[PDB]
C-alpha cells in the first residue's frame, strides 16, 4: 500500500493512517546532508528555516576564520566548502580496502594589512569520508556506522536538593557550554568558575559593572540573595574585579585592566568560550529572552545572568508567573535533566563537525606558528598549510572511537536499528560505570522519540536506546515527533512536529480516538498525556494535540513484533534485541502473520536494490539487473553475490522481477539477504504445536522436525574472513607462496602454484587457506578449528598494484570460507515475543505430533514458559498464523457477525497462505481471532483441522496414540538466532599455551581452555574436594613439568603424579622476593627448603 | 615484526643506568652536589620501580601513561590475587550449549560426541594403543585427529563410569557444580538432566555450561563420591530436596495424581 511493486498484505488496521510512515534511516542522511552544503537540505531549510541556512563545514570554518597573531597584521579566512563527485563506487571501495570519501576544497585568502594586498585561492586538504544512501560509511573497505549520541544539551538547568542539616530546600543552577569553562550558581559556595571554589554570587554581577541600586532593583525579591550581595569583603567594583581575579587564578600579577579582559575573554569572547546555537536558543527560550532573535549568537555576557538570578530568585519566591524586562514571560519551575526538551541528540553531522572543529583547532596552532616563521607576503597559504591535523582528527574518529561502530549486518533491520540508534555512553557523554541507575530508566518524554522497549540486555540496559519510527532530528539537534492538531474537538489533516517542551505546555490525546471521516469526537472525554507526562482523562475542550498514528513510540525492530501489546516490555525488549540478531536463510520467506512495517523497513533499509527510475526491465541476470527507463537511458544495478557481511553472515542478493515486466520508481527489483519480494523476512513460518512433549522442551527448550534440516528451511550461510600478509621483517622478507620445506604433499593440494587455495575447495579444520613462509620456517595461514565449508573467493593486494595498503606490509591476502549452517542440536531458536530456546531434540520427520491430514508440526514450545514469562503474544501470533496459512471464505452472514462489527478493510475473504498485517496497537483484537479461527479451510481433504477455540486433536508420531485433549497447534514465525555452536561449543584436552601466563588460553580461535573461576573453587571447597581443586589449579592449568608428566602418565596408563610446584607460587615467591620481602616456608620441625 | 616488552625493563634500565653513572661519578671524583643529586634521582628511580605513583608524579613512557612498577604487579583489582591467583583457564575441560535430556538417569548426562572425542583425546588414545586398533602412539594421535569409525566403540569403553564435573558461571552455590556420567550423544549440545536445573539455575535460553575431566584417581573418586548429583539431592541451605519435580514434571504428576469426579470408568 503506497509502495509500487510489493505482495499485497491484507490489513487488520481499524484506523486509517493520516500520515505515511516517514523515510526510515532519516536521522543519518538529514544530518550528513546538513553537515556539508547540500542542495536538497538547502531547499528543505529554505522551505522550513531562515533565509540563509549555514552548512556544518561553513559554520565550523566561520567559527575558525579569521586566524590572527593578536596584532591583526597577518589574517587567514577559509570559506566555501565545495565538493566534487565521489572517488569511486561503494562496491569498489569495499573491494580495494580504501575509504569511500570525497575530495574537499576551501576558498582561502591570506590578508596582509601593512604590506601589499594578497588575493584568494582554492586550497585542497584531503579526502573526507561521505555517507552512502544506506546511511553508512565505508572506512578501509569495511561498512562502519556513526550512532547518534544522547548528551545533556548546552543550556540552563535549575534543580532543588533537600538539605540534610536544615529542613530547607536548596536551589542549584548549572549552565554548561559547547566549548568553555563551567559556570554554576548555588544558594547559601555561591558561584564557581573554572574550579574557583566558593565565591559570592554578586561579585561576577559587580564585575559586569552593576551599581548597588541595580542589585537592589534587579535582585530585590527573595531574601538570602540580598544577604549574599551583602556578605562579601569586596563590595566595590574594582575591588570585586581584583577579588574574582585573585579567585580565578592565584598565580600571575592581578591587575584590574587584566582581570576585566580575562573575565570578558573567559565568558564574553566568542572564540575562547563557545555556547552553540542550541545553547543560546535553550537559555534564550528557557529564560524567556531574545524571543524572535536569529542564530549566530554569542556567550551569556550579562543580560542572561540577570534573567538566571531573577529566575532563581522567583524559584525561591514561589510564584510560577514571571515576566523579565526586555524578554518574553516564561513559567518558573525546576528543570529536569531526564526531560527530552533538555536532552539534545548530537548526530553523525555534529559528531563529525566536533572532530573537524578539534582538527581545525589543531591546525590553527600550526598555522599560527607557520605564518610566524614564514616570510611576510611571500608565504602563499596554499603553499604553507598543514593537512595532517584534520585528516588525523577525522581518521582517528572512525579509527578506534566508541561512537564510530561496525554496522550490525546480521540483517537489514539490525543495520536500520544500528543506524537509528541513541547511545548515552562514549566520549562527551557519561561512562558506563560512572552512569547511575536514574539515567537508565525510561522517562515520559521518551514517548515517540526513544524506544521504551528496545535496548541491549548486557551492562548497557536503558543506556543504548533506538530512535522511534516516526521521530526526526532538527538542524539544532533535538528529537521532534509528529502529531495532529485538533480544533475544538475537530481533528485536522495537518501534521505538526513537537520538540517536547511545547508538548509539555500542551495536552496530547492518544491514537485510539473514536475516528469517523469528519473526526469530530463522539466519546465525551479521552485519555490524554499531562504536562509532567502523567496519564490523565479530559474532554475535547482541553485537547489541542493528538497522536498522528499508533506505534509512534516503537523502534523498527520493536514495530516488527505482532501483538506487542499482548506481550510484556521485558519479553518484548528481548524480542527486539534477538530480532536484530536474526540470521538470513538460504530460502527466506516473509511472515504469514506480521505488521505492515516489514514491507516498508526492507525497502528503506537500503540492503535491497530499489528501482531509482520508472521503466521496463531490459534483461535479468543473477550478476546484475538492467532496466530500460521512460526517457531512454538504462540503469544497470550490479548485485553483490555472496558478500561476507560484518557479523559473519552472508549478504546474498537475487533478482525478483521478470524480463518482460514494467517497474515504477521506488519499486523492489532485487532480493536482499532478508527480503523475499521486498519484505523484512529474517526467519521462517513453521507449524508450531504448544504442549509439553516427553521432557525435550522442559524449561523453554525447543523441539525440531528433521524435515526443517532436510528441506533446508532454517539453513543459513556463514562466511568467516581470514586475513594474512607478507611484511618485510628485519630478519629477511616474508612471502605468500605454495612451497614449504617440512610438510607433506597431500596437504599441499587445495593450493595452486602461487600458494592460494583454488576457488570452491571444501576445507577440513587443519587445511591451509594461504601458503605463507617466514624467513626458512613455516608461518602459513591454516583454517581455524571449528570452521569448515567452501572457499567463495580469494583477494590479493600486491605492493606493485595500485591498491591502498597498510604501512610496511607488501602483499595482503584475505580468504572467504562459507559454511552452509544446517539448524543442528544446541543452536538457538526464538520467536518475535522474546520466547528464546535451544534445540533440545531434532526428531526424525515421522516421530512428531502430526495433524489429522498427516502434516508433522515443525516445533513444540513448552506451555509452562508462557504464563510465567508473561508473553501470550506468541500464542495469538500462532493462532492468527493458522488463519494466515488456512485460507478463509467467512460465510459472513445475512446481517454480519458481532466479532466482525468493527471488521477491518474488506478482510472477510482470504485465499490459501494469505499474509496478514496487524500493527502493534491498531491490530487484531482479542475476540476477532475467535471469529477468524471459526473459518472453513478444507486443506485438500473435505474436513477442518483446528477447532473454534483454535486447538487441534494431534496423533503422537512416537507413541501412535491420539493426545487425550486437543492441543494448541498453529503457524508461527520463528527466527534463526546468531548464538551458534560454531561460536559457543569449545573443548581442549591439551593444546597450545600462552608464553606470558603458563595456563591455557581463552577463545576457540587459539584453541583455548575454559575458565575455572574463584566461585568454582568456593564450590569445590564447599564439597571439600581438595584433590579435584588442587588438580585443577596445578597440572590442569599452570605446572609445566606437571602437564607433560600427567599427559605422559595418562598415555602410558600409570598413576597420576602428585602435583608439587605450581607456577603461580613460583611467580608470587619471585615477585615478593623482587619487592625485598624475604619469604621462607618452615616445616613442622627441622630446617627450611627451596621448592626444587 | 613488532617487539612486545614489559615496563619493568624501563625501570630496571633507569635504575642500572643511574647506578652505573653514579659509580663513574664516584670513580672520577665529581662534586658532592652532583653525586647527591644523582643519588636523589636514583632513590626516586628505585622508589618508582618498587612503587610508581607512590611519591609525586609517576614515570610515563608512551603517550603520558604511568608504567606498572613491581608493587603494581602485586596490587589493584587486576595485579594479582583478585583475578590472577583465584581464577584461571584449565586443560581437560570444555564448554557447550546445554539442552534438556529427559531420557537420562540423574547420575547420567549427555556429551556432543565430537566434543567428547576431543575431551578424552588421551584416554581414547591409551585404550586405542593398549588394544591393537592403533599400531603406534603417533598413529593413534593421527587416528583420533581423523576421527575414524574404530574410536567410537572404544570411547564407550574409555568413558565407562568415568565422571565429568559440570559447572555453570556464575557458581552461586555448592550444587552450582555437579559430577555426572557422560553418555555419548550426536549433535553439538550438552544434554543436562531436567532435575539439576533448579540447582544450576540454568534456563535453556542460550545458557552454556563448562565440563571438566578429573584425571587423578583421587579426583575421579571424589567426583563419584561427593559431588555426584544422585548424592546431592538435599539443599546445603535447609536440607529440602532441590533435585525434585519442577515446572513440567509438577504439572505432569499433578495431572497424574489429581482425583477428579465425573470421569470415565
Amino acid at each position: 500500500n503506497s509502495v509500487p511493486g510489493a505482495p499485497n498484505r491484507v490489513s487488520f488496521a481499524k484506523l486509517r493512517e493520516p500520515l505515511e510512515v516517514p523515510g526510515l534511516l532519516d536521522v543519518q542522511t538529514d544530518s550528513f546532508e546538513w553537515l556539508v552544503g547540500s542542495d536538497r537540505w538547502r531547499q528543505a531549510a529554505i522551505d522550513r528555516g531562515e533565509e540563509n541556512p549555514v552548512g556544518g563545514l561553513e559554520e565550523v570554518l566561520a567559527e575558525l576564520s579569521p586566524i590572527e597573531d593578536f596584532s591583526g597584521s597577518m589574517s587567514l579566512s577559509f570559506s566555501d566548502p565545495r565538493f566534487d563527485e565521489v572517488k569511486a563506487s561503494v562496491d569498489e571501495c569495499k573491494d580495494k580496502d580504501m575509504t569511500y570519501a570525497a575530495p574537499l576544497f576551501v576558498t582561502a585568502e591570506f590578508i596582509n594589512n601593512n604590506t601589499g594586498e594578497i588575493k584568494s585561492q582554492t586550497v585542497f586538504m584531503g579526502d573526507f569520508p561521505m555517507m552512502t544512501e544506506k546511511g553508512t560509511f565505508i572506512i578501509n573497505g569495511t561498512e562502519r556506522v556513526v550512532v547518534s549520541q544522547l548528551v545533556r544539551s548546552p543550556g540552563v538547568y535549575f534543580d532543588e536538593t533537600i538539605d540534610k542539616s536544615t529542613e530547607k530546600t536548596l536551589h542549584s543552577v548549572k549552565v554548561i557550554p559547547g566549548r568553555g569553562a563551567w559556570l554554576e550558581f548555588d544558594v547559601d559556595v555561591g558561584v564557581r568558575i573554572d574550579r574557583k571554589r566558593r565565591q559570592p554570587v554578586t561579585v561576577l554581577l559587580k564585575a559586569l559593572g552593576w551599581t548597588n541600586e541595580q542589585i537592589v532593583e534587579r535582585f530585590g525579591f527573595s531574601e538570602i540573595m540580598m544577604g549574599t550581595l551583602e556578605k562579601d569583603t569586596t563590595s566595590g567594583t574594582d575591588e570585586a574585579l581584583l577579588d574574582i581575579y585573585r579567585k580565578l587564578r592565584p598565580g600571575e600579577p592581578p591587575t584590574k585592566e587584566s582581570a576585566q579582559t580575562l573575565l570578558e575573554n573567559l565568558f564574553f569572547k566568542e572564540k575562547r568560550y563557545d555556547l552553540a546555537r542550541v545553547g543560546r536558543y535553550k537559555v534564550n527560550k528557557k529564560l524567556g529572552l531574545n524571543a524572535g532573535k536569529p542564530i549566530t549568537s554569542s556567550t551569556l555576557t550579562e543580560e542572561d545572568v540577570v534573567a538566571t538570578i531573577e529566575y532563581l530568585v522567583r524559584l525561591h519566591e514561589g510564584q510560577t508567573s514571571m515576566t523579565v524586562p526586555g524578554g518574553v514571560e516564561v513559567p518558573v519551575e525546576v528543570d529536569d535533566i531526564d526531560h527530552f526538551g533538555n536532552r539534545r541528540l548530537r548526530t553523525v553531522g555534529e559528531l563529525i563537525q566536533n572532530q573537524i572543529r578539534v582538527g581545525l583547532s589543531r591546525m590553527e596552532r600550526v598555522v599560527r606558528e607557520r605564518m610566524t616563521t614564514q616570510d611576510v607576503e611571500a608565504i602563499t597559504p596554499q603553499t604553507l598549510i598543514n593537512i595532517r591535523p584534520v585528516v588525523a582528527a577525522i581518521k582517528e574518529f572512525f579509527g578506534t572511537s566508541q561512537l564510530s561502530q561496525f554496522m550490525d549486518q546480521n540483517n537489514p533491520l539490525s543495520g536500520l536499528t544500528h543506524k537509528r540508534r541513541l547511545s548515552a555512553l562514549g566520549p562527551g557523554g557519561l561512562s558506563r560505570e560512572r552512569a547511575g541507575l536514574e539515567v537508565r530508566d525510561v522517562h515520559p518524554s521518551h514517548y515517540g522519540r526513544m524506544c521504551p522497549i528496545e535496548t541491549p540486555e548486557g551492562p548497557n540496559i536503558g543506556l543504548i536506546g533506538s530512535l522511534s519510527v516516526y521521530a526526526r532530528v532538527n538542524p539544532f539537534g533535538f528529537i521532534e515527533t509528529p502529531y495532529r492538531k485538533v480544533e475544538n474537538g475537530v481533528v485536522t489533516d495537518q501534521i505538526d512536529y513537537l520538540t517536547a517542551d511545547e508538548e509539555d505546555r500542551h495536552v496530547v490525546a492518544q491514537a485510539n480516538s473514536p475516528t469517523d471521516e469528519n473526526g469530530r469526537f463522539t466519546e465525551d472525554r479521552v485519555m490524554v498525556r499531562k504536562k509532567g507526562g502523567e496519564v490523565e482523562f479530559v474532554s475535547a475542550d482541553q485537547v489541542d494535540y493528538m497522536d498522528v498514528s499508533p506505534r509512534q513510540m516503537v523502534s523498527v525492530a520493536t514495530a516488527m513484533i505482532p501483538f506487542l501489546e499482548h506481550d510484556d516490555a521485558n519479553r518484548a525488549l528481548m524480542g527486539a534485541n534477538m530480532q536484530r540478531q536474526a540470521v538470513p536463510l538460504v530460502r527466506s520467506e516473509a511472515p504469514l502473520v506480521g505488521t505492515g512495517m516489514e514491507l516498508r523497513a526492507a525497502i528503506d533499509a537500503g540492503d535491497v536494490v530499489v528501482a531509482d527510475k520508472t521503466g521496463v526491465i531490459e534483461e535479468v541476470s543473477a550478476d546484475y539487473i538492467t532496466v530500460m527507463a521512460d526517457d531512454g537511458t538504462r540503469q544497470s544495478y550490479r548485485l553483490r553475490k555472496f558478500a561476507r557481511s560484518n557479523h559473519g553472515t552472508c549478504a546474498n542478493q537475487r533478482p525478483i522481477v521478470d524480463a518482460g515486466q514494467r517497474v515504477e520508481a521506488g519499486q523492489v527489483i532485487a532480493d536482499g539477504p532478508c527480503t523475499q519480494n521486498g519484505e523484512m523476512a529474517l526467519g521462517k513460518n513453521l507449524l508450531v504445536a504448544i504442549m509439553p512433549w516427553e521432557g525435550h522442551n522442559y524449561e523453554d527448550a525447543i523441539i525440531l522436525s528433521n524435515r526443517l534440516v532436510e528441506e533446508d528451511v532454517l539453513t543459513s550461510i556463514h562466511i568467516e574472513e581470514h586475513e594474512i600478509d607478507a611484511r618485510d621483517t628485519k630478519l629477511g622478507a616474508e612471502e605468500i607462496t605454495r612451497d614449504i620445506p617440512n610438510v607433506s604433499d597431500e596437504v599441499l593440494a587445495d593450493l595452486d602454484e602461487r600458494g592460494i587455495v583454488r576457488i570452491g575447495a571444501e576445507v577440513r579444520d587443519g587445511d591451509i587457506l594461504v601458503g605463507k613462509v617466514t624467513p626458512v620456517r613455516d608461518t602459513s595461514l591454516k583454517v581455524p578449528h571449528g570452521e569448515s565449508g567452501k572457499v567463495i573467493g580469494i583477494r590479493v593486494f600486491s605492493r606493485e598494484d595500485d591498491d591502498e595498503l597498510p604501512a610496511g606490509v607488501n602483499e595482503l591476502v584475505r580468504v572467504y570460507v562459507a559454511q552452509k549452517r544446517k539448524i543442528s542440536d544446541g543452536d538457538k531458536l526464538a520467536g518475535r515475543h522474546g520466547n528464546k530456546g535451544v534445540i533440545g531434540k531434532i526428531l526424525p520427520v515421522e516421530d512428531m505430533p502430526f495433524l489429522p491430514d498427516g502434516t508433522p508440526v515443525d516445533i513444540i514450545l513448552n506451555t509452562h514458559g508462557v504464563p510465567r514469562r508473561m508473553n501470550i503474544g506468541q500464542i495469538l501470533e500462532t493462532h492468527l498464523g493458522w488463519v494466515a496459512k488456512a485460507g478463509w471464505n467467512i460465510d459472513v452472514a445475512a446481517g454480519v457477525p458481532d466479532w466482525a462489527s468493527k471488521l477491518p478493510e474488506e478482510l472477510y475473504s482470504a485465499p490459501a497462505d494469505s499474509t496478514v498485517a496487524t500493527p502493534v496497537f491498531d491490530g487484531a483484537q482479542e475476540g476477532e481471532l475467535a471469529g477468524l479461527l471459526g473459518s472453513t479451510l478444507p486443506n485438500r481433504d473435505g474436513e477442518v483441522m483446528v477447532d473454534a477455540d483454535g486447538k487441534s486433536t494431534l496423533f503422537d508420531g512416537r507413541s501412535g496414540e491420539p493426545f487425550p485433549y486437543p492441543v494448541t497447534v498453529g503457524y508461527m514465525y520463528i527466527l534463526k538466532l546468531h548464538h551458534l555452536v560454531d561460536d559457543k561449543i569449545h573443548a581442549r584436552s591439551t593444546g597450545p599455551y600462552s608464553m606470558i601466563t603458563q595456563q591455557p588460553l581463552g577463545g576457540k580461535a587459539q584453541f583455548g581452555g575454559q575458565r575455572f573461576g574463584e566461585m568454582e573453587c568456593w564450590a569445590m571447597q564447599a564439597y571439600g574436594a581438595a584433590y579435584t581443586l588442587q588438580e585443577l589449579l596445578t597440572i590442569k592449568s599452570d605446572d609445566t613439568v606437571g602437564r607433560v608428566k600427567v599427559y605422559e602418565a595418562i598415555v602410558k596408563g600409570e598413576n597420576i603424579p602428585e602435583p608439587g610446584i605450581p607456577e603461580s607460587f613460583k611467580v608470587l615467591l619471585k615477585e615478593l622476593q623482587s619487592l625485598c620481602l624475604n619469604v621462607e616456608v618452615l616445616s613442622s620441625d627441622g630446617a627450611a627448603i627451596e621448592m626444587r | 615484526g613488532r617487539f612486545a616488552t614489559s615496563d619493568l625493563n624501563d625501570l630496571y634500565r633507569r635504575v642500572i643506568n643511574r647506578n652505573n653513572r653514579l659509580k663513574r661519578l664516584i670513580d672520577l671524583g665529581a662534586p658532592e652536589i652532583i653525586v647527591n643529586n644523582e643519588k636523589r634521582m636514583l632513590q626516586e628511580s628505585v622508589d618508582a620501580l618498587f612503587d610508581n605513583g607512590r611519591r609525586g608524579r609517576p614515570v610515563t613512557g608512551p603517550g603520558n601513561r604511568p608504567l606498572k612498577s613491581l608493587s603494581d604487579l602485586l596490587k589493584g583489582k587486576q595485579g594479582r590475587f583478585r583475578q590472577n591467583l583465584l581464577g584461571k583457564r584449565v586443560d581437560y575441560s570444555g564448554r557447550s550449549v546445554i539442552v534438556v535430556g529427559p531420557q537420562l538417569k540423574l547420575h547420567q548426562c549427555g556429551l556432543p560426541k565430537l566434543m567428547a572425542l576431543e575431551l578424552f583425546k588421551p584416554f581414547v588414545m591409551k585404550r586405542l594403543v593398549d588394544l591393537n586398533h592403533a599400531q603406534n602412539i603417533k598413529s593413534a594421535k593421527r587416528m583420533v585427529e581423523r576421527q575414524r569409525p574404530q574410536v567410537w566403540d572404544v570411547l564407550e569403553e574409555v568413558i565407562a563410569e568415568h565422571p565429568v564435573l559440570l559447572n555453570r558461571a556464575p557458581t552461586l552455590h555448592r550444587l552450582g557444580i555437579q559430577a555426572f556420567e557422560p553418555q555419548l550423544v550426536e549433535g553439538k549440545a550438552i544434554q543436562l538432566h531436567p532435575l539439576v536445573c533448579e540447582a544450576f539455575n540454568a534456563d535453556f535460553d542460550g545458557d552454556q555450561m563448562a565440563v571438566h575431566l578429573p584425571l587423578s584417581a583421587e579426583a575421579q573418586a571424589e567426583a563419584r563420591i561427593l559431588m555426584l548429583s544422585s548424592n546431592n539431592i538435599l539443599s546445603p541451605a535447609s536440607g529440602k530436596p532441590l533435585a525434585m519435580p519442577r515446572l513440567d514434571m509438577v504439572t505432569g504428576l499433578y495431572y497424574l495424581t489429581t482425583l477428579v469426579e465425573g470421569a470415565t470408568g
Binding site: 564439597y1023 571439600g1024 574436594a1025 581438595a1026 584433590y1027 588442587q1030 | 583421587e218 571424589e222 561427593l226
Partner: peptide, 24 residues
Amino acid sequence: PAGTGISRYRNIQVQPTEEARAAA
C-alpha cells in the same frame, strides 16, 4: 586443608585384609 585435606584423611594406609590376601 578443608574436606579431604586433613592429616587424618590425606594420610590413610589402606592394606588388603589378612583373610583377603591368602584368599587372593
